Design a protein around this nucleic acid. Structure first.
Ligand SMILES: [Mg+2]
Lengths: 603, 1337
DNA sequence: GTACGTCCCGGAAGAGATTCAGAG
DNA sequence: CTCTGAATCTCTTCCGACGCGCCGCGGGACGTAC
RNA sequence: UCCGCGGCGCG
């Protein structure tokens, strides 16, 4: 290939071929005059070295070099590694009819459809536009189609809307991890210059909105469209291929809103009334005459399917909260009422969705899913849960606990200056006493934060569960745990140094108050260590995954029944304490090998 | 006490600790490194003159000719900086050197040379440093980063555990010279001494010792102590020293003076040793079996027979004992060789060696160095004397010698550049002691074993390489010299040195491209410590200890700033107060404390001696006398932290700001934030984008002034005075009386930098911020640069923010923005793109740039002139033509018959530049480069005329202003001593020389004024001639190109859903949807909020500092709007004065103590007017304000104290049941636009090697489907789509043509075929001897 | 100055040398 | 003393994640004529 | 011109 200028960027193979042919020609010329054996042997050895270099460079010592220092490549180098044909140009190849951009949310979409920008909509489907335009006879040739598509008149957008109605597309994340890394949606035209993707899908991709890039593809032929419509929707992937739990679990915000929904308080406006059905509970709530969460007796009519496929209509008077009735408005017919009486956190809602799928079928499950997402966003926005700076109440006994711990370590040190104790044992003792102080202060802070609220209950007084914003946000299961709230409120415990031991001085300051310089400096060690570890661990895991996946490539199920009688004895694991996993989650979804006998043997 | 321009906007500051040392010249490393390389250094030290004195003096092969060095001098640069970046030539200067060549006659080597010749010769070109501290190489500015390398000297590594998998730790001691071959020693599981050279095969250690002219007896005596055996008439009496019996094993009954001391079968006690010391026992009787394991050291020869009785280093036996006893020997000397005290390593190594001859050792060394060569004595001797003891190849630096001496505890810290026998034997002895158990190993991570390079050292090294190359060249040329028939310029050539310097400055791993789009970005780029580069580590060979921070990093290198990703901890950044020691180590300031008084004088401590002393923390309270208020203060002695007494410390920290670097020190409320999010926020802050209109940051750190002044972006005033004529283009300053030179005082002239292309496609502009008649003081800001305001650093803007989840549009990290933000037009950024067109020379004739273009109509030509160049100001969009550029491909092959056939139905073709698809904009400037000898078109003539007019008008205005000031100065001088109010200026000022006056200092002062006036007019004429000649001449370009057209597009980018915005605590996110103003929530006062974040991120990303920043901003605006309300009514000055005074005291003991009684009424009025947009608040990094100050300051305003205000909703219109938090936060825009990553492709170009679509965005290509993608698709039942996608859409050509024809026809059917990339693999594997083929169907 | 001819870091695994252990 | 000989030590090879975006340099030298 | 090498940056 000639480049910009009077020089030609020669390839390595050309240079190697020139060298080998030049040496061969020189040797052919030399032997004609019957040269002495020494020189012909020397030039033969030159030729042999050169041909070995061409065939495989770098296997022998003193590998040949090109321009300045870089060793020239050869065919053996052209086959191997990431720079070779097999793993770079054959297994994975660049494809046309594709595009990429950044992602936004757009939470007003249904989960079987996604947004798609106008510009890509025009650019990707140009052949389809040409075909439809030629069928409608607005152009005798293709050049007029060129002008019309490049000028984007008002007559092309209607055609584009017509050709997109039922044409599935594929979305993709660059570091795809599992089989949910590829899904298909039904595109919907939208303005802007970004793709809108349904929030509930975002848990599967493990994709945040910090600049992730999605790549689009178009199934071209007819069979591709039908196959994508039969297998590639998000509606046909409701359970993970790794475990039986649903993978469309509400991740962060809707779970917070729903956890705000149901937590009855002892006293609120609108106590002690009786309602007909849930359909007027909203009427009371939105008029401001009744608080969102309050004790109330209402009549609920749930449909149950004890009979052979038909639903039984039974009615009663249940003691519940208004918000629970409002949620009962959205549940399908099958589910019994006793499933929305609890705090309804994250695990509870996941299990409830799982049993809804298990009992009612498939379509009601997906309808319930997107409806619950809508209502969760609406009521979470209504609630307005904001974090404040006075919401982190520090326990008042922290100072005295710290003083006692310091007095104990001081007297232990004084005993050390008496020459009665060694170094390792006092080290272990001070570590133990600091751990004891840490857990004690953590327990005190948890106790006086989680239930600090007290109410007169329209009487003398009563103690109820607290409505602190941070506690509510951490106990729901949306984001956070006990460790993070403990670090943010109480002292952070004992950090470790790169040697692996534990620094003798704990950090006696939480994030709400200030931090001394060395206290920050020590935690810098752990931060850097964690970042380096997470840098290298992904690189290791990718190679391990490739090694696992290459070996099981050819195992394909081919027969419906082998017909044997040999099986493996299955028993629950007992490590030496409490049972870790029972038979329920270990034998489920398997075929029996031998008949199960009750301890009524011969039964 | 404040200067006048600090009176415009005083920044309230918190803090209690009084600082003692202000921020130094923040950009000092580059400048003070480079002010050693291009300087005439007398007597020679660490400079170019040293390099010449090191390599240049050369004596030929007894040719009586010598080439010596005299001096050097650098001429003025041919072009200034501006011409350099506008053209593309290197900002370099010629390097003149005066050289002396002498040739002697016969019969005498030492006498006076018969003939000499001296002249100036040219050699090479050196890039210069601009006053910004940067380099210009090829029309492109570039920056050099300092490198951290491995320190020269001796070092003792240990290699814990891994080797031999047995737990027996080995020990190695390597010597790393500054320039030469390596040398290292190590052990084996067999406990032997081994020498290795440059990682080659293993050799025994004694070979070097024997080669250094040491006999075996000398070696044994040096490495071991001596014990004497005396054969008396009975039992071989032995001389005893009691201290040697520590840990030795007994074999008999030890008795002396007829008294039993040690019992048979038992081991010594300390009391027995004490008893032996009491009795001073010296000689004891010894059994013959006690000498059954000792080895003789020296040889014994029989006098009578003349043979060798016992050789060196072999164990003695009873028969040998009898022979030596009967030979008449009385003194018998042997070894000590205890199990724990002294290992017999030297003895066993000398046993295991195969040779015992120095010539044999030289033969072994010579064969090892060069395999397959017959050794000889002279070659081996020369090679051994040249490997280690030759000045040319081996040379330790002064730093290397100092460290080498220090690690061995010698006395004189000065020595030569080569090593000697004493050094190597001492190294061996130290290694033996380390193995023996005395002494300690040395780690690597300690900063006392690491060194920082800079520009000067690397430049000198490359220059020395160039000189050694030209040196061997001049030697080989002078070996065939002649009697001064040639002049001394032919041997010296400008090719090697220039090539070396150009390749170093242009293509090196450390000459990295400048990344500038913000002043902070360059303040943090030039202060970079990279661990990579030549002589350093590699990315894939870095473990974990090199990445983790050592506990000696406090105050020298930043612990919290580093680029996250593949290289963490190798690109660490230098601290704020840190400097470079003279030798090259890092050091940080401290304060020396007396017994009770903390003296204010500053002492510098390196990274080694600090550990010996003890250092107290900076954040410790103290009294006015320096006494510590407590009796215990936490400190650090040796990498630990503990509690010490009232008086045991000797040094004190200077301030609390020295732990961090400049990158992250701008984050307010840092001490309340985690390390991870602090690192991330620093990274985003480094990568901001200029805004159209900068706004002051509400919550700063009080350091922005230094970072704004010290960057090369703001035209800081040089000399004080008063402004006289301000304009959007230039600024002139009238000089004060006390700052004038005696001659040619005049007045200063500046030149602002208007809209010009930046380096990262942003736009740098300068706006004058000085009024008219405003006096200025020396070293002050006049005109701010990009992202700066009144001398402060303003990256983004401040906006009203509120925290709540809002209808899911802020799901996890997305942000929604009201239309108000884009309404005020406050996030608009300006981007400048450069489009180039080349006019090369090809076959069949050159191409034409005329506007004669076919196949287009008036619609495509209405925007072009006659020449073929777009006008300035023509609003161009995607689909127009900028330059009409046509390539005459030719091969027309005209025929009288076949050519008219083409015209029956229904050459040069266009190659014009194409606008990038999607971007609008306006053209601002068109610049043309033409090779000399080519006819310029009309537009080139007009452009060069415009440049001539601009240059002449600029020079004329400069003369006009300069001489106006000069004559004003003349009038001011003439006011005294014969003043004429009107008699002087009857006739114009041109003749003020014929004035009759007395002769005094005033008179000859005026004479000097007139003389310099005449000199000025002459010089201005000369340089006007020179400038017009320079601008009228042509310019050299690349070979083979005819002319170059440069056109600049200037697109204006707005905000749109898809852009990335981030705070200063790491809470990044992409905006999601733009909303009408009515929909966002509003408060009871009526004002709407602008941005709503997501509160869900606070528990996990525990960056609690953002909430505190929000509350502080709310407080600032609560003061600001109150000031606004007081100002809107025309109120008198006393009430606002007292209100501002109350606002400024407002706290406990601080360092400000400002007063308003010393402000003029006009001045306080202007201060109030400039403060209406809120009160800026300064907060130190680790000495910030607590909660009580915030509560009190909010109480000063009428805002609720709890910080949570009740808020209403816009959609439904009812009160939220829980109040939310609102306030003001500093929000940034990053340089990741949405109209840069959006891409689509239907069918574009195809590659040539394999018919596959290309990759990238600039090349119109598509995305890649990886192997994990294939696995994910295969995991489903996906069959047809995978085959179709990797067969038709990718590889097959006939398949895809058929598919296209079918799609345009309305059918959908596929024919697979076979991919051609597999056919490529087939051919390539067939290219070998393998027979690859495909069998039957 | 230029066209042109020639030229030029662990970690894991196995293969091969060593070794010493012990039987004949 | 001698022959296996299983075991052990030492030398040589391959292997270390996957998508992008921006920028800069690249057959160069060395002689031989033209 | 579509390729190689190097550096920086984002997921
Ligand atoms: Mg991410």
């Amino acid at each position: 290939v000639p480049l910009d200028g009077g020089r030609f960027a020669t390839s390595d193979l050309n240079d190697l071929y020139r060298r080998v042919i030049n040496r061969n020609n020189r040797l052919k010329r030399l032997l004609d005059l019957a040269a002495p054996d020494i020189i012909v042997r020397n030039e033969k050895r030159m030729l042999q070295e050169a041909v070995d270099a061409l065939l495989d460079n770098g296997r022998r010592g003193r590998a040949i070099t090109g321009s300045n220092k870089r060793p020239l490549k050869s065919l053996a180098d052209m086959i191997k590694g990431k720079q070779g044909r097999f793993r770079q140009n054959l297994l994975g190849k660049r494809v046309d009819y594709s595009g990429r951009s950044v992602i936004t949310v757009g939470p007003y979409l249904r989960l079987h459809q996604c947004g798609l920008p106008k510009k890509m909509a025009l650019e990707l489907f140009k052949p389809f536009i040409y075909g439809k335009l030629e069928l409608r006879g607005l152009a005798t040739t293709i050049k007029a189609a060129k002008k019309m598509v490049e000028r984007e008149e008002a007559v092309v957008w209607d055609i584009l809307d017509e050709v997109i109605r039922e044409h599935p597309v594929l979305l993709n994340r660059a570091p795809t991890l599992h089989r949910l890394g590829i899904q298909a949606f039904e595109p919907v035209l939208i303005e802007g210059k970004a793709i809108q993707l349904h929030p509930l899908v975002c848990a599967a991709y493990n994709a945040d909105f910090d600049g992730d890039q999605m790549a689009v593809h178009v199934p071209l032929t007819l069979e591709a469209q039908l196959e994508a419509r039969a297998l590639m929707m998000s509606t046909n992937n409701i359970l993970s291929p790794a475990n039986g739990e649903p993978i469309i679990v509400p991740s962060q915000d809707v779970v917070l809103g729903l956890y705000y929904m149901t937590r009855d308080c002892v006293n609120a406006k609108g106590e002690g009334m009786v309602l007909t059905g849930p359909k007027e509970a909203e009427r009371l709530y939105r008029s401001g005459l009744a608080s969102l969460h309050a004790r109330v007796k209402v009549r609920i009519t749930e449909y149950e399917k004890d009979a052979n496929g038909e639903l039984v209509a039974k009615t009663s008077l249940k003691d519940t909260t208004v918000g629970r009735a409002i949620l009962w408005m959205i549940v399908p017919k099958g589910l019994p009422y006793s499933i929305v009486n609890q705090a309804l956190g994250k695990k509870a809602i996941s299990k409830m969705l799982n049993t809804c799928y298990r009992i009612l079928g498939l379509k009601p499950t997906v309808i319930f899913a997107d409806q619950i997402m809508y209502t969760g966003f609406a009521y979470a926005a209504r609630s307005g849960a904001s974090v404040g700076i006075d919401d982190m109440v520090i326990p008042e006994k922290k100072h005295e606990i710290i003083s006692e711990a310091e007095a104990e370590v001081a007297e232990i040190q004084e005993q050390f200056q008496s020459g009665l104790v060694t170094a390792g044992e006092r080290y272990n003792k001070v570590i133990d006493i600091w751990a004891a102080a840490n857990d004690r202060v953590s327990k005190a802070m948890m106790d006086n934060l989680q239930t600090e609220t007290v109410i007169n209950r329209d009487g003398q007084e009563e103690k109820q569960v607290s409505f602190n914003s941070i506690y509510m946000m951490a106990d729901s299961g949306a984001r956070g745990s006990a460790a993070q709230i403990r670090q943010l409120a109480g002292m952070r415990g004992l950090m470790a140094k790169p040697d692996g031991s534990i620094i003798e001085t704990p950090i006696t300051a939480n994030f709400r108050e200030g931090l001394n310089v060395l206290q920050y400096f020590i935690s810098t060690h752990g931060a850097r260590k964690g970042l380096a570890d997470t840098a290298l661990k992904t690189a290791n895991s990718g190679y391990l995954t490739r090694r696992l996946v290459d070996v099981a490539q050819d195992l394909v199920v081919t027969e419906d029944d082998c017909g044997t009688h040999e099986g493996i004895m299955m028993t629950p694991v007992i490590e030496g304490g409490d049972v870790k996993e029972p038979l329920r989650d270990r034998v489920l979804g398997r075929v029996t090998a031998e008949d199960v006998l009750k301890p009524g043997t011969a039964d | 006490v404040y200067s006048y321009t600090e009176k415009k906007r005083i920044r309230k500051d918190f803090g209690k600790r009084p600082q003692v040392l202000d921020v130094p010249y923040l950009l000092s490393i580059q400048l003070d490194s480079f002010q050693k390389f291009i300087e005439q250094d007398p007597e020679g030290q660490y400079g170019l003159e040293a390099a010449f004195r090191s390599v240049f003096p050369i004596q030929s092969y007894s040719g009586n000719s010598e080439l010596q060095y005299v001096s050097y001098r650098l001429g003025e640069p041919v072009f200034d900086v501006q011409e350099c970046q506008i053209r593309g030539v290197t900002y370099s200067a010629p390097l003149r050197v005066k050289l002396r060549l002498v040739i002697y006659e016969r019969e005498a080597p030492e006498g006076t040379v018969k003939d000499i010749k001296e002249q100036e010769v040219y050699m090479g070109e050196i890039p210069l440093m601009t006053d910004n501290g940067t380099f210009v190489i090829n029309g492109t500015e570039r920056v050099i980063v300092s490198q951290l390398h491995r320190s020269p000297g001796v070092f003792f590594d240990s290699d814990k555990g891994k080797t031999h998998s047995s737990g027996k730790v080995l020990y190695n001691a390597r010597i790393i010279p500054y320039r030469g071959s390596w040398l290292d020693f190590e052990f084996d599981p067999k406990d032997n001494l081994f020498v290795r050279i440059d990682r080659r095969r293993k050799l025994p250690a004694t070979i070097i010792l024997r080669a250094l002219n040491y006999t075996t007896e000398q070696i044994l005596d040096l490495f071991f102590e001596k014990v004497i055996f005396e054969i008396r008439d009975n039992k071989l009496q032995m001389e005893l020293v009691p201290e040697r019996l520590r840990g030795e094993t007994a074999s008999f009954d030890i008795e002396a003076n007829g008294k039993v001391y040690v019992e048979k079968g038992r081991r010594i006690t300390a009391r027995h040793i004490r008893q032996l010391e009491k009795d001073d026992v010296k000689l004891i009787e010894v059994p013959v079996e006690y000498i059954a394991g000792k080895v003789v050291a020296k040889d014994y020869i029989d006098e009578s027979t003349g043979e060798l009785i016992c050789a060196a280093n072999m164990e003695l036996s009873l028969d040998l004992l009898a022979k030596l006893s009967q030979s008449g020997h009385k003194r018998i000397e042997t070894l000590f060789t205890n199990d724990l005290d002294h290992g017999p390593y030297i003895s066993e190594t000398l046993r295991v060696d195969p040779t015992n001859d120095r010539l044999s050792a030289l033969v072994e060394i010579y064969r090892m160095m060069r395999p397959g060569e017959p050794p000889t004595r002279e070659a081996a001797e020369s090679l051994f004397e040249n490997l280690f003891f030759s000045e040319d190849r081996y040379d330790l630096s002064a730093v290397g010698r100092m460290k080498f001496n220090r690690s061995l505890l010698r006395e004189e810290i000065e020595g030569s550049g080569i090593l000697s026998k004493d050094d190597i034997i001492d190294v061996m002895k130290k290694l033996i002691d380390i193995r023996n158990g005395k002494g300690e190993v040395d780690d690597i991570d300690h900063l006392g074993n690491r060194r920082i390079r800079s520009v000067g050292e690397m430049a000198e090294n490359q220059f020395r390489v160039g000189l050694v190359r030209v040196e061997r060249a001049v030697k080989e040329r002078l070996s065939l010299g002649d009697l001064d028939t040639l002049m001394p310029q032919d041997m010296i050539n400008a090719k090697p040195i220039s090539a070396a310097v150009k390749e170093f400055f242009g293509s090196s791993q450390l000459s990295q491209f400048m990344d500038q789009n913000n002043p902070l970005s360059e303040i943090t780029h030039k202060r970079r410590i990279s661990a990579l580069g030549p002589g350093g580590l590699t990315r894939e060979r870095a473990g974990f200890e090199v990445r983790d921070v050592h506990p000696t990093h406090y105050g020298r290198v930043c612990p919290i700033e580093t680029p996250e990703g593949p290289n963490i901890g190798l690109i660490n950044s230098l601290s704020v107060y840190a400097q470079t020691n003279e030798y090259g180590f890092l050091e940080t300031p401290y304060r020396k404390v007396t017994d009770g008084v903390v003296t204010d004088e500053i002492h510098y401590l390196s990274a080694i001696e600090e550990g010996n002393y003890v250092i107290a923390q900076a954040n410790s309270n103290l009294d006015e006398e320096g006494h510590f208020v407590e009796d215990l203060v936490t400190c650090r002695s040796k990498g630990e932290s503990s509690l010490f007494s009232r008086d045991q410390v000797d040094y004190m920290d200077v301030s609390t700001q020295q732990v961090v670097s400049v990158g992250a020190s701008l984050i307010p409320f840092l001490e309340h934030d985690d390390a991870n999010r602090a690192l991330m926020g620093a990274n985003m802050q480094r990568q901001a984008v200029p805004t159209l209109r900068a706004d002051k940051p509400l919550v700063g750190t009080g350091m922005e002034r230094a970072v704004a002044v010290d960057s090369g972006v703001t035209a800081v005033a040089k000399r004080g005075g008063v402004v006289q004529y301000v304009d959007a283009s230039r600024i002139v300053i009238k000089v004060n009386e006390d700052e004038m030179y005696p001659g040619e005082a005049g007045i200063d002239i500046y030149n602002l930098t208007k809209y010009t292309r930046s380096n990262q496609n942003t736009c740098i502009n300068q706006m004058p911020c000085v009024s008219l008649g405003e006096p200025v003081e020396r070293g002050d800001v006049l005109a701010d640069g990009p992202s700066t305001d009144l001398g402060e650093l303003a990256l983004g803007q401040n906006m009203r923010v509120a925290f709540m989840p809002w209808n899911g549009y802020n799901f996890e990290d997305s942000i929604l923005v009201s239309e108000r933000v884009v309404q005020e037009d406050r996030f608009t950024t300006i981007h400048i793109q450069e489009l180039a067109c080349v006019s090369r020379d090809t076959k069949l004739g050159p191409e034409e740039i005329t506007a004669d273009i076919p196949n287009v109509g008036e619609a495509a030509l209405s925007k072009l002139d006659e020449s073929g160049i777009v006008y300035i100001g023509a609003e161009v969009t995607g689909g127009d033509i900028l330059v009409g550029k046509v390539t005459p491909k030719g091969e027309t092959q005209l025929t009288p018959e076949e050519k008219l056939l083409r015209a029956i139905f229904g050459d040069v073709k266009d190659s014009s530049l194409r606008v990038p698809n999607g971007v609008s904009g306006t053209v601002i400037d068109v610049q043309v480069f033409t090779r000399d000898g080519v006819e310029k078109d009309k537009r080139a003539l007009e452009i060069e005329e415009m440049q001539l007019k601009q240059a002449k008008k600029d020079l004329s205005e400069e003369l006009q202003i300069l001489e106006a000031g000069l004559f004003s100065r003349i009038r001011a001088v003439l006011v005294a001593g014969g003043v004429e109010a009107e008699k002087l200026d009857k006739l114009p000022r041109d003749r003020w020389l014929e004035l009759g006056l007395t002769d005094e200092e005033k008179q000859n002062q005026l004479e000097q004024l007139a003389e310099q006036y005449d000199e000025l007019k002459h010089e201005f004429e000369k340089k006007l001639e020179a400038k017009r000649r320079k601008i009228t001449q042509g310019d050299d370009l690349a070979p083979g190109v005819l002319k170059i057209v440069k056109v600049y597009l200037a697109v204006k980018r707005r905000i749109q859903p898809g852009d990335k915005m981030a705070g200063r605590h790491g809470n990044k996110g992409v905006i999601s949807k733009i909303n009408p103003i009515e929909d966002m929530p509003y408060d009871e006062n009526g004002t709407p909020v602008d941005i709503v974040l997501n509160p869900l991120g606070v528990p996990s990303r525990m960056n609690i500092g953002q909430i505190l920043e929000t509350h502080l901003g709310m407080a600032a605006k609560g003061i600001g709007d109150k000031i606004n309300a007081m100002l809107k009514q025309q109120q008198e000055v006393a009430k606002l004065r007292e209100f501002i005074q109350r606002a400024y005291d407002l706290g406990a003991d601080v360092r400000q103590k400002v007063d308003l009684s010393t402000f003029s009424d006009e001045e306080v009025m202007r201060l109030a007017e400039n403060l209406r947009k809120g009160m800026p608040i300064a907060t130190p990094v680790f000495d910030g304000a607590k909660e009580a100050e915030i509560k009190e300051l909010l109480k000063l305003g009428d805002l609720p104290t709890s910080g949570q205000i009740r808020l209403y909703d816009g959609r439904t219109g009812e009160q939220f049941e829980r109040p939310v938090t609102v306030g003001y936060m500093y929000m940034l825009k990053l340089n990741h636009l949405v109209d840069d990553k959006m891409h689509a492709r239907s069918t574009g170009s195809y590659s040539l090697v394999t018919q596959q679509p290309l990759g990238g965005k600039a090349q119109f290509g598509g995305q890649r489907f990886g192997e994990m993608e294939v696995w994910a698709l295969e995991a489903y039942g996906a069959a047809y789509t995978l085959q179709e996608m990797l067969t038709v859409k990718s590889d097959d050509v006939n398949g895809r043509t058929k598919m296209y024809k079918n799609i345009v026809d309305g059918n959908h059917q596929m024919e697979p075929g076979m991919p051609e990339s597999f056919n490529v693999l087939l051919k390539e594997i067939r290219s070998l001897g393998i027979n690859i083929e495909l069998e039957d169907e």
